[PDB]
From a paper:
One mechanism by which phages and other mobile genetic elements are able to overcome the CRISPR-Cas system is through the expression of anti-CRISPR proteins. We previously reported that gene 34 from Pseudomonas phage JBD5, which encodes the protein AcrE1, shows anti-CRISPR activity against the type I-E system of P. aeruginosa strain SMC4386 (4). We show that AcrE1 binds to the CRISPR-associated helicase/nuclease Cas3 and that the C-terminal region of the anti-CRISPR protein is important for its inhibitory activity. In summary, these experiments demonstrate that AcrE1 functions by blocking the activity of Cas3 without inhibiting the DNA-binding activity of Cascade.
The C-terminal β-sheet region is unusual because both sides of the sheet are exposed to solvent, contrasting with typical β-sheets, which pack a hydrophobic surface on one side against helices or other sheets. We also examined the packing of the C-terminal β-sheet within the crystal and observed no contacts that stabilize it in this position. Residues 82 to 90 form an antiparallel β-sheet that protrudes at a 90° angle from the end of helix 3. This sheet structure appears to be stabilized by multiple interactions between residues at the base of the sheet and residues in helices 1, 2, and 3. A salt bridge is formed between E41 and R89.
Numbering used by the authors:
A (entry chain C): 2 to 92
B (entry chain A): 2 to 96
């Protein structure tokens, strides 16, 4: 039941309490954001490749395509999703 | 520039200095770790999709395979690569 937002809360809470931690934990926060962004870029790319494969009727890769769907749903549980207003929302 | 290990080390450094942060920041560290694990699991699946495409000779989607290679390379720049002994290694220490 752990979420991306939980980690983000903890990081800012930490250096607001202890300002000497600002430089290192804002950096960690930026690295976490970078990681999430890169992951979601590759995930979308994988999803679109999987969609293409399905449309081509290539049943040999059907297990793989199904795995991409399962993994994408699991990701949204932890990291939510960004809507059209640029807000990251959770279930 | 700055790597996954930098973030990892920063979390630990912080609660070693301020023990009262250990609960919140250990949790954060485990979330970071989970996110990296799920990303890398999906990445490996994406890589095998591309492998399948290329084995079939399906050139229509070759651009997607090149895209996946580029993104995996960029990921490894930041997050390194876990070797067969489960050690995450970076840069020229890979392969």
């Amino acid at each position: 039941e752990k979420k991306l937002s939980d980690a983000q809360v903890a990081l800012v809470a930490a250096w607001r309490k202890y300002p000497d931690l600002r430089e290192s934990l804002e950096e960690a926060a930026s690295i976490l954001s970078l990681i999430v962004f890169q992951a979601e870029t590759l995930s979308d790319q994988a999803n679109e490749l999987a969609n293409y494969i399905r449309r081509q009727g290539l049943e040999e890769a059907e297990g793989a395509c199904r795995n991409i769907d399962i993994m994408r749903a699991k990701w949204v549980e932890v990291c939510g999703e960004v809507n059209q207003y640029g807000i990251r929302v959770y279930g």
